[PDB]
Design a protein around this ligand. Sequence first.
Ligand code: ATP
Ligand code: ATP
Ligand code: MG
Ligand code: MG
Length: 1164
Amino acid sequence: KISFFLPFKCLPAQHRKLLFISFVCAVLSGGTLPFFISVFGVILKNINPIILSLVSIGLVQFILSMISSYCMDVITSKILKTLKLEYLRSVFYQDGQFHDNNPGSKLRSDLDFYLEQVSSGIGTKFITIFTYASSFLGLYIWSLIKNARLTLCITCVFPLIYVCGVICNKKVKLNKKTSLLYNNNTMSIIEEALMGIRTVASYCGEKTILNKFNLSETFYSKYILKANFVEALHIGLINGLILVSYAFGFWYGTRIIINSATNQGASVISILLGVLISMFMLTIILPNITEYMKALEATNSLYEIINRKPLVENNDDGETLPNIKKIEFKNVRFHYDTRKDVEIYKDLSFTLKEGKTYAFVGESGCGKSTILKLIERLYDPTEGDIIVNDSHNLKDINLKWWRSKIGVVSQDPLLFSNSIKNNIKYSLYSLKDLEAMENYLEMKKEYQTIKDSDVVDVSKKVLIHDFVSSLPDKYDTLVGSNASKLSGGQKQRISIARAIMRNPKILILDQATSSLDNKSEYLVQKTINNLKGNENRITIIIAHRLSTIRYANTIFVLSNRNEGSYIIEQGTHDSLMKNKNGIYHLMINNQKPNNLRIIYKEIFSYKKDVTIIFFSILVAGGLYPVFALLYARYVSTLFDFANLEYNSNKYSIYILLIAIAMFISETLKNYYNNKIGEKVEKTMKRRLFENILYQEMSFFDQDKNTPGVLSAHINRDVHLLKTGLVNNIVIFSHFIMLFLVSMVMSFYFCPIVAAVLTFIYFINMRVFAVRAFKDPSFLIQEAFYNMHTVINYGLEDYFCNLIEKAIDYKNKGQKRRIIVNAALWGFSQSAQLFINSFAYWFGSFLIKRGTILVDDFMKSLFTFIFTGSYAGKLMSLKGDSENAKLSFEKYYPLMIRKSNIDVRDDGGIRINKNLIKGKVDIKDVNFRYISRPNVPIYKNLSFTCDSKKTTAIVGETGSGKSTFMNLLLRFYDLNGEILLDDINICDYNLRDLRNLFSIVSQEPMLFNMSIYENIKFGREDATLEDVKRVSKFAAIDEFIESLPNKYDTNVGPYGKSLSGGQKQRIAIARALLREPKILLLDQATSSLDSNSEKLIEKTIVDIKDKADKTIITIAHRIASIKRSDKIVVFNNPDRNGTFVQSHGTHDELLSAQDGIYKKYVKLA
Ligand SMILES: Nc1ncnc2c1ncn2[C@@H]1O[C@H](COP(=O)(O)OP(=O)(O)OP(=O)(O)O)[C@@H](O)[C@H]1O
Ligand SMILES: Nc1ncnc2c1ncn2[C@@H]1O[C@H](COP(=O)(O)OP(=O)(O)OP(=O)(O)O)[C@@H](O)[C@H]1O
Ligand SMILES: [Mg+2]
Ligand SMILES: [Mg+2]
């Protein structure tokens, strides 16, 4: 065993008393039915006071049962809050090795899988057990005092039912665990598809994903259906065993009758009829024990994750030094966990003092960013040490205080999606929390102390104050998901400002000036190298353009030329190039309302599946009241002896025949339920995702249709249907069949009372049917995608407290919807006696009149007890049925919506890839975004690229360079024209338009498949030989052939298990395999050293030496621009638009008229 009361362990003393009250106020309400029997039996056989007593005990039953339902639904939605908060707080404090093996899409699935079990095992189903177990003892203890030997045969049977459960549970968890893995698999395909929709749409790979989705769901439905078969057999078998035992009891009971009535109604019949009700209660109890025993394992598995202990603990056991000096590596080694057989470092060691600048240079696979991550203690070394100030090791200093001084600008900027000033002010929270919380909550209030004076000047210091002051909502406008609204240089400037604001002692810049022109870079560098406090700090620059590090106290050069990188040179700018003919000299010489009808229509189509369940419900529903015959026709044939033994042997065999029919009906009722529900779930899951995957780009720029929201809709609110909407109907049908059989059985005795009270039961049945700060999922996904920023700037408790205010905001009807359900639950348990009292009332008159007898009245009233007692099951699945309908109503329009720009339209000019000139002409252009329609960008653009020529485009940051590309691929429609071979782009049947282009985007992206499949994206029919051929021009087919599982190696999610230079060359290779007619490049050499850069340049100029390809490029390095044919300059003198100024300079007209190009040539 594990335990019993785990979910109720971590509670305060304010809810434990509520638990005690809810426990005690149910046993009382349960022990009134046998008390009612004991009173009614003695009072019937002998007017106002008795009716008043009956109504009074009914009322106190109502009042006692109303409280237990209110004081139980309050604990449920506090446990379900506490667990979910404790889960995702010991995920932020976990080390980095935990995040490599456990992707973010694997955690959400487990979370919202186990919480469903916990919710469906501690709700209203917890109290029905205890309130129907009291009625068991009330009738079992009564029947025991009279004759115990007749009754104590089932206690010998209790051990046998305990054995089926063990095996029938052991044969379940295997399949459930095997299905959870494929669930985790198919959840990692949705997020990666929605984040990279711009690439999927461009390469037409939105059909390859559907096949993976369908395979992963097909291997899932099989195992889940195989698992939920055993559970339909277990409960179907227990009923049969119980009825067989009852048959043995009846057989033993007839023995004393045949003895006495021969050798010398009846009380024995009464005893057996009292025993029957106990078994009828066990029929209701047992199918809720399992669902409670499923929750213990789930919450155990959750506490297993919550009580994890990582290697790098963020305790408060560290130290606090005065100041920072002399970081020092000493014989460091390191390797990663996935690739245990791939070493990186040989003998890494150096020293760094304060008040100086430093630099790192090398190839694109060495260890630079790995050092960046190794300083901040995301990871730990294996053999060396990072001793600080020659008397203290880094594994003994307080991590919070150490991170309270470092400013970071990473190789991939990661901003949140609220606003600019809040993103810039987030740097200070981790310092104010140190000021307040370590003095004497004083934290949540001092965040207002941060005034709007430092934001202004720190924005002035990065040349963004002018642009941010021109648009509406200066410091209040919001940025989209991953800051998709802004541009690259803008995000770099925002991150630099966020780093400067806190005045760090240590600063680490990792390719921060990659997407910025020469002039702004020079000005920003002049600003940073004279900032206040520069007399004592340590700045660490990493760069590929060696012009920015001309001044530096030391320059470290390192290489790996095949078992580990190492340093080869040390010296300044002047004392390094003139010394020898090393690598550095070569480098510097190189540079120089009625919607639910859609569901039922799908249910009433599997015609042979709805038939069997119907004929099984018809048999399992009414076979308890049919026993009423078996006694009557038996008791009618007691005083006709000399043939009694024949009947006695006959009716026991009839009971056996009924027992063997209970089994089949129950198990076929319980299995085909889930079989029908899963098949609705699959279709409703597929259609939504399929429709969403073909929509346009503006649909994804909206505020609410974010990637973290849609996945939750799909998974959760398509899974809810199977349970709620398809099980509740089955329950209603079972109840209806009980009622329809009981009303037939009651006419057999006396039709008057039946015709009277069926009306009342119909009315009481009608009551049950007709009675009726953003989201949490946004924040959780937004945190899981940007874990590095959140760990660097110390933002765990902030999001923790911020998600609580959304859980509470979503729960507002959580208070009103409970009292209604509690009143209904009380009315279910108290609607039985109010009717019996009225029956006695209007029966006394007719009995006194002399028209109806007492016996038939009694045994016509007694037979409705089953349908009176079964009403408690009409309240176990109400909330999940309502939530499902609400969710369906608020995701149906996504399912039905259609797109304006759809690739499936197959009508238009079909274009062949044999006769194409490749001329792109522009007549006039005017464009404006919908997110902020006051900012004009383009005004009368005019330029051309003729055919098989090379064209270069230079401009200022924010001018619209990476917007022409998007307009050219039908991401956004137009006022103006763009012509390909003198015909507009809107009339080409864009399946072929997107076939002959090939882009190299500004931020590459990869998926969790292998390299072989990522390079084959789009073009499925291709051999490994073509891949080997095309991976040679990319200058990457040496690293891959030094690696286990060369082309079968699995990259991580989004490409995090590779570097930036590799991720980019792989994208280049992917673009070259398609054999494109038009090649679009956008900063294709931003993260590459000069050697790889000139190799790819050799490939490009070789391709340019021959015809049959039209190339367009964008770059800031002046070196790779002179070899073009025409150079186009964009400008924006007054902030109203852009127009062409220069045209066709080609490095021969650099200063003829006043322009900007004459600066960009000389500044670098
Ligand atoms: N999570 C990971 N698991 C396993 N290996 C990794 C992981 N992240 C990076 N690597 C490997 O570590 C090596 C070093 O990568 P590094 O961070 O030094 O790239 P880089 O030098 O910054 O590249 P660039 O110079 O182009 O920016 C790479 O060869 C890469 O394959
Ligand atoms: N999704 C969007 N919604 C609204 N406006 C946008 C969106 N994307 C870009 N913009 C606007 O377009 C302008 C320029 O965008 P773009 O990214 O094309 O410039 P860029 O030339 O790529 O900049 P860089 O040269 O730094 O990459 C920005 O000022 C921005 O306000
Ligand atoms: Mg890097
Ligand atoms: Mg750009």
